[PDB]
C-alpha cells in the first residue's frame, strides 16, 4: 500500500502513467511526485530525502509549539498574553518581564535576548554537528537519518516490520505538519490573527469568513 | 475556567493505571481478531 | 536554421560554448543553460515538459488579461473590472461575475462554487493529461495531436518541426511578458493597456522612469 | 594540499564530512553541499563559474556601495544621496548625474543613454567572456588571466592557486555583506555605514533584536 510498485500515489488513478522511473517505492512517503525531476540524480535524491525528513520533524515540533501556548491561555489555564500568538511569542524575552513559562516568572524569566540568541548558536550547533556526522556519544548510530536506540529510547523501532511502516507515518504526519506550517504562516502574514483565531472566524461564518475574504487586501491599488 | 479542567485531570491517573493492568490482555483481542 | 548544431543560439556570434548536452534535436534550442540545471537528461526532458506547458498557459494568459481591458477601452462591451489584476474581485458584488457584461451570461455569484467546480475539472483535465482519458491515449506528454489538432496543422513532419519551434518562441515571449504584465501591476496599479497607451502618450515622461522607480528605492 | 587537498579545511571543521564529488581540487572547497546541489559535474562545474563571478561582483559592489557614503562624512563629497540604493535618482537630479558632484565630471541626465551604452558596452564585455574575444581567445574560461593579468601577480602555479582561495573567500565574504546591507536597508532605510554608525554609538540600543525585531509582525516601523 505504501511500498513497491503497487503503492498509492500523488495522481491517484491517473498517476500510473506519470511516476518517475527513480521513484521506484523504496523509501517512506514515495507517492511518485517528481514532475519537476529534482530527485533524478541518485545523490542528489538522497541529499534532499534528509531534508524531507527533518524539514518535517522541526515542522511537527512547530505544529504544537505555534498552538500550545495559546490553546493553553484559551483552554483557560495559565496566561501568555502576546506569548499565546506563535509569529508575536518572539518578544516575550525581550518584553521586560521575564519571558517566563506556562505564566510562571518562578521559571526561565529570560529577558536577556543575547543570552538564549548565543546559548542556542553553541547548543545546536553541537547537536546540529553530530547530526552532520555519526559521532560517539550516539549509542545507536546506524543510519544518520534514522539513529536507533540512543534517540529510539522506548524502541518502537526495534521491530523491522514496524519501522517501515512507522516510518511512512512518520514522514506522512511530517508532510501534513509541514504543509499546515506553510499554511499557519501565509494565514499570519495576510490575516494577521491567530491560526486559532482563524479556525474561530471559519466557525462562525464559513461562508464569509474564508481565505477570499482578503483576496483584495493585497491589491496593486496606484 | 479551570472547574472542568481540574476535574478532567482526575481521568489521567485512572485511564494511565486501567492501562497499566489491561492493555497487555487488550493486544491479545485485536491480535487474535486481526 | 533551428535544429541541428548549426542552430541559432542566444548569445549569437559570442555564443561561442554551448552546453554539451544542449545539442539540437529540440524545438527552441539556442544553447542557453549557463545555469546547468538540464545536465542530466532526466531532468532536462522534465524541464523540457515544464517550459511548454507554462509556456501554453502564459500564450492564454497574456490574451485573455488584455482582451477584456481592450475591450472595455475600446467601447466593444462594458465588463465588471477589465484590468486582470481585480477581474476576481467580480464575484465580490452585487451582480456577481457576468461574462462580457451580460446578466444573462454564466451569471456567477458564488466563488466557492467556481472554486470547487475548477478543481473538478481542472484535476480531471490534468489527469487526463498525464494518463490519457477521452480525447486520447498519451504518446507524446506534450504533443498529443489527434484529437487535439482537428484542423491538421502539423500532419507533414517537416511543418511539424518549424511549428513546435514557433511555439515555443511565442510561448517564450508570452512569458515574459506575462511577467512584465505581474511587475507593471505591482509598479503601476494601471492595467497593462493602460500602461501601453500612457507610453504612447508621452513616452519621454510615462515610463518606468521619470516615474515610480524612486519611489522604489 | 592545505587548501587542495583530503586534509583541506571544512565548514563545519571537526565534525565535517566532505561529501564525494567535492575533493578539493578546486579552492573553496569546505565541503558544503549538504543540499546535494553540485552531484552532477557538469552542474558543478556551471555552479563554480557563477559562484565566482557572483563573488567578484559583489566584491565590486561592496566597495561601489561604501565608496559614497564613506567619502560623503570622512572626506570631501557632495553625493546626491550617498546610499547605494539611493543612487538611481542621482540621473534624476536637476543637474543629473555628477561625479564627486563636479558638473562637468560626466554629468549624465538621460536615463536612455547610460542604460543603453550599457547593454552596448556589458553586452559585448559578457559576449567576449564567453567566445573568447580579442583580449584573450583561447584561455581559461573562469580563470582568464594573461592580459587580464596586466601585474601578472599569480604567475606561479602554487602562488596562484592560493590566491584563488583567497579570491574567493574574499569574495564569498563580499556576497554575504552585500546581502547585509540589502536586508537592512529594507528593514532601516540608512547606508550600511549609517547602521555601523548606530552599532558604534550604542551596540545594545541598535541590535535588531529589539530596534525592529519585535516589529515585524503585528505591528512594524
Ligand atoms: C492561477 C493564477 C492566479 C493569479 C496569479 C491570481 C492573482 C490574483 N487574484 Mg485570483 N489569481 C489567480 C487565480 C485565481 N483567482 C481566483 C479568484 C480570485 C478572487 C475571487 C479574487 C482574486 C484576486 C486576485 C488578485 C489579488 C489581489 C491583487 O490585486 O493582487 C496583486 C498581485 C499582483 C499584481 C501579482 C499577482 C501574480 C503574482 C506573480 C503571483 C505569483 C504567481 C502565481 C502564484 C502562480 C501560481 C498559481 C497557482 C498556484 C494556482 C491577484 C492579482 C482578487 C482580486 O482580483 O481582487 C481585486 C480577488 O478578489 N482571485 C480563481 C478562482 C477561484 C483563480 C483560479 O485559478
Ligand atoms: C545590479 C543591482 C541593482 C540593484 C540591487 C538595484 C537596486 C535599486 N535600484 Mg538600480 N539597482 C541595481 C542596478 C541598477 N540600477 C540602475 C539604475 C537605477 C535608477 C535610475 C534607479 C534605480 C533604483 C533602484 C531601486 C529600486 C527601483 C528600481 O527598480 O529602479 C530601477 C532599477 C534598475 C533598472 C536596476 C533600488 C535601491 C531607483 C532608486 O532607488 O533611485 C534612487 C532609481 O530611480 N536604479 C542601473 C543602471 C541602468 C543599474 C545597473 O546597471
Ligand atoms: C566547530 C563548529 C562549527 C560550526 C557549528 C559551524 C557552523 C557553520 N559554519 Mg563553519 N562551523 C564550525 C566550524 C568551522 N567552520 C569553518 C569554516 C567555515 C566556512 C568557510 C563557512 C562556514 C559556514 C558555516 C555555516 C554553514 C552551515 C549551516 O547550516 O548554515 C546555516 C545556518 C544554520 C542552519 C543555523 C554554519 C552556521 C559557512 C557560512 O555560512 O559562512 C557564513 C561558510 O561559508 N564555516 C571552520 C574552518 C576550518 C571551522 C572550524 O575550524
Ligand atoms: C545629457 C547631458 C550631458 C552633458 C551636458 C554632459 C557633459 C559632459 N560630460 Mg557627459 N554629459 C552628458 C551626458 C552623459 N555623459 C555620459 C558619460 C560621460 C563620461 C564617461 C564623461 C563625460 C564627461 C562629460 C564632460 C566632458 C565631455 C566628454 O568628455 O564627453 C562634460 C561637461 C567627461 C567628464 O567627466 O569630464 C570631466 C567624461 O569623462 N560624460 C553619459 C553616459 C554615457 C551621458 C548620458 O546622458
Ligand atoms: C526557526 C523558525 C522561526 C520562525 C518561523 C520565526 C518567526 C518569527 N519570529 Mg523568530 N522565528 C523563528 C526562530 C527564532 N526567532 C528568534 C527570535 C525572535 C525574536 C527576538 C523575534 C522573533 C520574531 C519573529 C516573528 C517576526 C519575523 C522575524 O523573524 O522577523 C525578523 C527577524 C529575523 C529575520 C530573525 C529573527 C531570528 C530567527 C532566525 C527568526 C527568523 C516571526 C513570525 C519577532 C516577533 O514576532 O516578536 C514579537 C521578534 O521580535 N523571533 C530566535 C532566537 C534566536 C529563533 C531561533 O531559532
Ligand atoms: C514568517 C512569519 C511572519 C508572520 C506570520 C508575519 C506577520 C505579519 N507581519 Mg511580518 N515579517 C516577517 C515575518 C512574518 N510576518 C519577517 C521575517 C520580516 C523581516 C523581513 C518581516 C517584516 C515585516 C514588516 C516590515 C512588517 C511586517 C508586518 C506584518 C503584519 C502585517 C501583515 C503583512 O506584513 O503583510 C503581508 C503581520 C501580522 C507589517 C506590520 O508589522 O504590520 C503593521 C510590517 O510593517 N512584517
Ligand atoms: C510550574 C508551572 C507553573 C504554571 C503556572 C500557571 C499559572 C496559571 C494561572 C491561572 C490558574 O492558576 O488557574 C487556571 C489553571 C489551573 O490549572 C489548570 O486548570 C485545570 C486545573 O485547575 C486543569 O487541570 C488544567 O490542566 C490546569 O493546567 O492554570 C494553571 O494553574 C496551570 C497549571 C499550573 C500548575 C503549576 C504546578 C506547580
Ligand atoms: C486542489 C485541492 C484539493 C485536492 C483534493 C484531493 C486531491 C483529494 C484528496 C483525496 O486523495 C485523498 C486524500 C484520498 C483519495 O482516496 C480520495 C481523494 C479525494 C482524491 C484544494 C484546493 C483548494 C484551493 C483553495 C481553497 C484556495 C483558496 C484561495 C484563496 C482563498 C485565495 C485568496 C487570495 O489569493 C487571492 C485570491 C488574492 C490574494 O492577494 C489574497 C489571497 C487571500 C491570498
Ligand atoms: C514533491 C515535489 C516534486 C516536484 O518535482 C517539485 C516540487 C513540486 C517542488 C516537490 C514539492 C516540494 C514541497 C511540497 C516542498 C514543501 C516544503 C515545506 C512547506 C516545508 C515546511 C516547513 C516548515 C517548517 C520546517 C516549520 C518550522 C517551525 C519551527 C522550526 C518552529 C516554529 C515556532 C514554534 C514551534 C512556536 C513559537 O511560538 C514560534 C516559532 C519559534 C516560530
Ligand atoms: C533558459 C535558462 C538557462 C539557465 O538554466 C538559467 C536560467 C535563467 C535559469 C534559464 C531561464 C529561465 C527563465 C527565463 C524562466 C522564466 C520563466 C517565466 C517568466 C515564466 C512565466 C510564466 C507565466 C505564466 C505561465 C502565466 C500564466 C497566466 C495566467 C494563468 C493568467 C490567468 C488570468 C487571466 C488570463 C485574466 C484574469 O483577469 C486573471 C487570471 C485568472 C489570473
Ligand atoms: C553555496 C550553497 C551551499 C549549500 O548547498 C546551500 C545553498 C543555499 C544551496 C548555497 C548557499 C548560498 C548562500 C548560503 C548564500 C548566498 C549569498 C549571497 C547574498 C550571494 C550574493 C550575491 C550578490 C551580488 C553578486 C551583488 C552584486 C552587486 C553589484 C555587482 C552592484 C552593486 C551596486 C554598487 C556597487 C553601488 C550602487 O549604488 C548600487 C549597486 C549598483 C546595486
Not at chain 1, 559521532?135 to 517501515?164: H, I, K, R
Request: aromatic fraction near 12%.
Amino acid at each position: 500500500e505504501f511500498y513497491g510498485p503497487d503503492r498509492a500515489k500523488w495522481l491517484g488513478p491517473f498517476s500510473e502513467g506519470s511516476v518517475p522511473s527513480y521513484l521506484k517505492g523504496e523509501f517512506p512517503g514515495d507517492y511518485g511526485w517528481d514532475t519537476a525531476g529534482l530527485s533524478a540524480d541518485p545523490e542528489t535524491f538522497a541529499r534532499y530525502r534528509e531534508i524531507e525528513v527533518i524539514h518535517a520533524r522541526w515542522a511537527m515540533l512547530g505544529a504544537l509549539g505555534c498552538l500550545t501556548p495559546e490553546l493553553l491561555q484559551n483552554n483557560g489555564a495559565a496566561d501568555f498574553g502576546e506569548a499565546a500568538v506563535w509569529f508575536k511569542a518572539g518578544a516575550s524575552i525581550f518584553n521586560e518581564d521575564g519571558l517566563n513559562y506556562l505564566g510562571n516568572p518562578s521559571l526561565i524569566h529570560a529577558q536577556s535576548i543575547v543570552a538564549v540568541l548565543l546559548t542556542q548558536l553553541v547548543i545546536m550547533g553541537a547537536a546540529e554537528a553530530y547530526r552532520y556526522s555519526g559521532e560517539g556519544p550516539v549509542e545507536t548510530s546506524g543510519d544518520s537519518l534514522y539513529p536507533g536506540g540512543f534517540f529510539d529510547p522506548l524502541g518502537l523501532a526495534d521491530d523491522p516490520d514496524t519501522l517501515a511502516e512507522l516510518k511512512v507515518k512518520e514522514i506522512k504526519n511530517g508532510r501534513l505538519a509541514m504543509f499546515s506550517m506553510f499554511g499557519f504562516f501565509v494565514q499570519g502574514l495576510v490575516t494577521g490573527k491567530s491560526p486559532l483565531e482563524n479556525l474561530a472566524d471559519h466557525l462562525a461564518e464559513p461562508s464569509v469568513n474564508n481565505g477570499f475574504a482578503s483576496a483584495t487586501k493585497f491589491l496593486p491599488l496606484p | 475556567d479551570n472547574r472542568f479542567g481540574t476535574i478532567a485531570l482526575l481521568a489521567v491517573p485512572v485511564i494511565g493505571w486501567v492501562l497499566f493492568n489491561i492493555l497487555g490482555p487488550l493486544q491479545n483481542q485485536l491480535n487474535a481478531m486481526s | 536554421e533551428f535544429y541541428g548544431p548549426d542552430r541559432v543560439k542566444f548569445l549569437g556570434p559570442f555564443s561561442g560554448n554551448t552546453p554539451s548536452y544542449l545539442k539540437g534535436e529540440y524545438p527552441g534550442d539556442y544553447g542557453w543553460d549557463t545555469a546547468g540545471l538540464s545536465a542530466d537528461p532526466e531532468t532536462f526532458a522534465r524541464y523540457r515538459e515544464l517550459e511548454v506547458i507554462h509556456a501554453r498557459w502564459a500564450m492564454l494568459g497574456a490574451l485573455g488579461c488584455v482582451t477584456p481591458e481592450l475591450l472595455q477601452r475600446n467601447g466593444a462591451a462594458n465588463f465588471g473590472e477589465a484590468v486582470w489584476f481585480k477581474a476576481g474581485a467580480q464575484i465580490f458584488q452585487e451582480g456577481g461575475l457576468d461574462y462580457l457584461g451580460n446578466p444573462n451570461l454564466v451569471h456567477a455569484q458564488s466563488i466557492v462554487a467556481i472554486l470547487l467546480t475548477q478543481v473538478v475539472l481542472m484535476g480531471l483535465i490534468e489527469g487526463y493529461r498525464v494518463n490519457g482519458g477521452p480525447a486520447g491515449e498519451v504518446v507524446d506528454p506534450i504533443y498529443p495531436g489527434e484529437a487535439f489538432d482537428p484542423l491538421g496543422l502539423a500532419d507533414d513532419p517537416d511543418t511539424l518541426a518549424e511549428l513546435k519551434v514557433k511555439e515555443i518562441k511565442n510561448g517564450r515571449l508570452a512569458m515574459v511578458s506575462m511577467f512584465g504584465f505581474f511587475i507593471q501591476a505591482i509598479v503601476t496599479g494601471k492595467g497593462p493597456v493602460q500602461n501601453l497607451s500612457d507610453h504612447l502618450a508621452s513616452p519621454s515622461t510615462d515610463n518606468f522612469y521619470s516615474l515610480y522607480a524612486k519611489t522604489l528605492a
